[PDB]
Amino acid sequence: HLLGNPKLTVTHVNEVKAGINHIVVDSVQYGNQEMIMEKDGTVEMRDGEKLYINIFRPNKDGKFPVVMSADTYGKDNKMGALWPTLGTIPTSSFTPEESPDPGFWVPNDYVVVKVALRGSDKSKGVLSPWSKREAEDYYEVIEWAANQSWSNGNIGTNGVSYLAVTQWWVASLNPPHLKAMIPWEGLNDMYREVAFHGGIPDTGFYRFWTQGIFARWTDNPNIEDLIQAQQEHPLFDDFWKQRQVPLSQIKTPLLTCASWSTQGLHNRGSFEGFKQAASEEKWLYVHGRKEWESYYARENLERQKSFFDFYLKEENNDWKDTPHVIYEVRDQFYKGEFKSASAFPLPNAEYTPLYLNAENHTLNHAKISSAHVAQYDSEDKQQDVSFKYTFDKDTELVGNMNLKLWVSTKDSDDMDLFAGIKKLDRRGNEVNFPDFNHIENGQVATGWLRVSHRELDQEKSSIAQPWHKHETELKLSQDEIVPVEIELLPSGTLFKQGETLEVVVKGSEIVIGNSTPGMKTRYEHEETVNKGMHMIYTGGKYDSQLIIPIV
Ligand SMILES: [Cl-]
Ligand SMILES: [Cl-]
């Protein structure tokens, strides 16, 4: 049954033509699985635009729950040398990247819908990624699918990256047949999470990705110019306000994956997405491993299936026994302990200030009487200042950290600050983690702040996570000393007794380089306001401090 038919030969993806295909899929789990694929189905939007889709379904009678995903990357798409750190990603041949594998889902009696959103495949309409107008298009395909002859009315959305962002968007519209959702690592506020980091423009990945969309659909003259967008809209203004999902409208039952490894792209938002959703039924899975790798691991496919079985098949399984938070405490690279909790942020987090001392470059439990100033050269990529704490007992830090600094510059009216948290083993050697974008030489946590963008949103800011307004640039007179609070992105790490936490503040990127030379898969921040010495002031009135989430 689920052993498949070794007798049959597998269908190759360019054997399949418009219309009805009977195909034999190379299922990772279930062998040679027969099914029906409708290639180049169309769904008509309110305005008349046709979106193109693929439909994979069991070759049998009945109505089935529907698992759907939607993007603009190519519905028909089909690495060890090229991008060796992507890890192990097993899927059938009928699985575009990050989508639900019909070779897994369909033999378990689901329909899979793969949606090419507006401006992709054979649509030449407006392509405006991760906007409300795209979500409205998605809304209509969900509702269309609830009414078809192979459908049981129950639609669940699923998938990774772009295929997650679009889920946050469309769930915010509350489609009546959206019964469950799995945004498996997706941002939902482009200004704060991909276009800029603490107000500093992303000159790497962001551009890469937007340029990549242009290059894919070359005959489409209607692709939104997001490169110009970034250039024209340096503040969180009306353009960017429309690209922050209204998360608290989400009511749909929710399974979120966040990852400690994705800081600088999907990490901040996956957490905001779980936090802010109004969903009465919501669950969060957090891991410190690789992205696509973890989505397709059998363990996590079974986690997804158990969720969808309960909500789309309405089946009595034990899904609701799942703790609302399951999270990895990272010890080393591909080594840690999974724990559970009933909420994120962790209810038993004790936010603990550690005070910085520029005089001996320590962190400290108690305030520093003596006032002091640490300096570094902001244009020198080899220069930074560090502050370290060695733990006398095993300690786990899980959640947001907040670096609070007093700072000044003299050769400029603005400052770009790059913050990092590193772990140092008992020998004094840095302990590396998976980090963005699939780098293996990463650190514990990372965060950024253009200092003219230091204004706090008081009603959204908290002890562990500052929220910045991004509406007024408060430029600097020299040598004006100002308080900043920097958001270190969510992380989960064990510091054993005799291991060290190091805060690093720098004028440029702290971990340098990426896992694809000559290709900008990682954020880069090459457009900087930095000049001359940065001053970090500590001790006395200058209560510079790191707030840590001890759990
Ligand atoms: Cl937290
Ligand atoms: Cl906001």
Task: Find the 487 Cα to ligand 1 centroid distance in Å.
Answer: 11
By C-alpha distance, which of 309, 350, 327, 338 is closest to 270? 327
Residue with tokens 């560090």: 386
Distance (Å, whole) CA 462 – CA 352: 13
Q: Which ligand is nearest to the CA of 548?
A: 1
CB 535 within 8 A of CB 407: yes
Backbone angles phi, psi at 515, to 5 degrees: -100, 5
By C-alpha distance, which of 448, 412, 444, 449 is closest to 431? 444
Q: Where are the beta strands (DSSP E) in 391-520?
A: 395-409, 416-424, 430-431, 433-435, 439-442, 445-450, 482-495, 500-506
For residue 120, how many C-alpha atoms fall within 13 Å in the half-sphere facing its CB? Answer: 22
Task: Find the 403 Cα to ligand 2 centroid distance in Å.
Answer: 20
Tell me, what amino acid is at 248?
A: S
Instruction: Compute and round to an integer the Cα radius of gyration of the chain.
Output: 24
Neighbours of 135 (CB within 10 A): 23
CA dihedral over 441, 443, 445, 447, signed as positive or negative: negative
- DSSP collapsed to 3 states, 6-55: CCCCCCCHHHCCCEEEEEEEEECCCEEEEEEEEEEEEEECCCCCEEEEEE
Task: Find the 429 Cα to ligand 1 centroid distance in Å.
Answer: 27
| Token code pair at residue 78 | 């089909």
Alpha carbon distances (Å) from 533 to 7, 379, 506, 524: 71, 8, 11, 21
By C-alpha distance, which of 187, 316, 179 is closest to 254? 179
β-pair type (282-287, 325-332): parallel
Q: Which ligand is nearest to the CA of 245?
A: 2
Distance (Å, whole) CA 119 – CA 130: 13
3 state DSSP class of 91: coil
Q: Which ligand is nearest to the CA of 460?
A: 2
Q: How many Å separate Cα 106 from the centre of its chain? A: 27
Distance (Å, whole) CA 161 – CA 382: 33
For residue 133, how many C-alpha atoms fall within 13 Å in the half-sphere facing its CB? Answer: 11
By C-alpha distance, which of 301, 64, 295, 298 is closest to 179? 64
Q: Which ligand is nearest to the CA of 399?
A: 1
Q: Which ligand is nearest to the CA of 492?
A: 1
CB 325 within 8 A of CB 286: yes
Task: Find the 363 Cα to ligand 1 centroid distance in Å.
Answer: 20
| CB burial string 339-352: b at 16+ within 10 A, e below | bebeebbbeebebe
β-pair type (325-332, 335-341): antiparallel
Task: Find the 400 Cα to ligand 1 centroid distance in Å.
Answer: 4
Residue with tokens 């690209």: 243
Distance (Å, whole) CA 527 – CA 409: 17
CB 263 within 8 A of CB 289: no
Alpha carbon distances (Å) from 85 to 270, 491, 518: 22, 20, 15
Tell me, what amino acid is at 271?
A: F
Task: Find the 344 Cα to ligand 1 centroid distance in Å.
Answer: 7
Distance (Å, whole) CA 69 – CA 142: 10
Task: Find the 499 Cα to ligand 1 centroid distance in Å.
Answer: 21
Alpha carbon distances (Å) from 78 to 92, 211, 384: 9, 21, 44
CA end-to-end distance (rounded Å), the chain: 46
Distance (Å, whole) CA 4 – CA 2: 5
Distance (Å, whole) CA 33 – CA 103: 7
| Token code pair at residue 403 | 């670096």
Q: Which ligand is nearest to the CA of 401?
A: 1
CA angle at 490 for the pair 441 and 347, rounded to the nearest 5°: 140
CB 482 within 8 A of CB 415: no
Task: Find the 461 Cα to ligand 2 centroid distance in Å.
Answer: 10
Alpha carbon distances (Å) from 147 to 42, 46, 48, 140: 14, 16, 19, 11
| Token code pair at residue 6 | 């070794």
Tell me, what amino acid is at 188?
A: N
Residue with tokens 């097993």: 90
CB 24 within 8 A of CB 10: yes
Distance (Å, whole) CA 356 – CA 340: 32
Residue with tokens 């001392």: 357
Task: Find the 484 Cα to ligand 1 centroid distance in Å.
Answer: 19
| Cis preceding-peptide flag for 345 (omega within 30 of 0) | yes
Sequence-separated contacts (24+) of 377-381 with Cβ below 8 Å: 377/507, 377/532, 377/533, 378/409, 378/415, 378/416, 378/507, 378/508, 378/528, 378/530, 378/531, 378/532, 378/533, 378/534, 379/507, 379/508, 379/530, 379/531, 379/532, 380/507, 381/508, 381/509, 381/512
Distance (Å, whole) CA 499 – CA 476: 38
Distance (Å, whole) CA 16 – CA 237: 46
Residue with tokens 């990490």: 267
CB 276 within 8 A of CB 248: yes
Task: Find the 549 Cα to ligand 1 centroid distance in Å.
Answer: 6
By C-alpha distance, which of 26, 156, 41 is closest to 94? 26
Task: Find the 349 Cα to ligand 1 centroid distance in Å.
Answer: 7
Task: Find the 234 Cα to ligand 1 centroid distance in Å.
Answer: 28
| Token code pair at residue 66 | 């529907």
The torsion defined by the Cα of 186, 191, 193 and 194, in degrees rounded to 10, comes to: 90
Write down all domains in the chain, each with its CATH number in brackets: 11-191+244-345 (3.40.50.1820), 192-243 (1.10.3020.20), 346-509+536-551 (2.60.120.260)
Task: Find the 469 Cα to ligand 2 centroid distance in Å.
Answer: 6
Backbone angles phi, psi at 494, to 5 degrees: -90, 130
Task: Find the 447 Cα to ligand 1 centroid distance in Å.
Answer: 15
β-pair type (416-424, 196-197): unpaired
Distance (Å, whole) CA 137 – CA 368: 57
Q: Which ligand is nearest to the CA of 456?
A: 2
Burial class of residue 370 in the structure, from the number of CB atoms within 10 Å of its CB (0-12 exposed, 13-18 middle, 19+ buried)? exposed
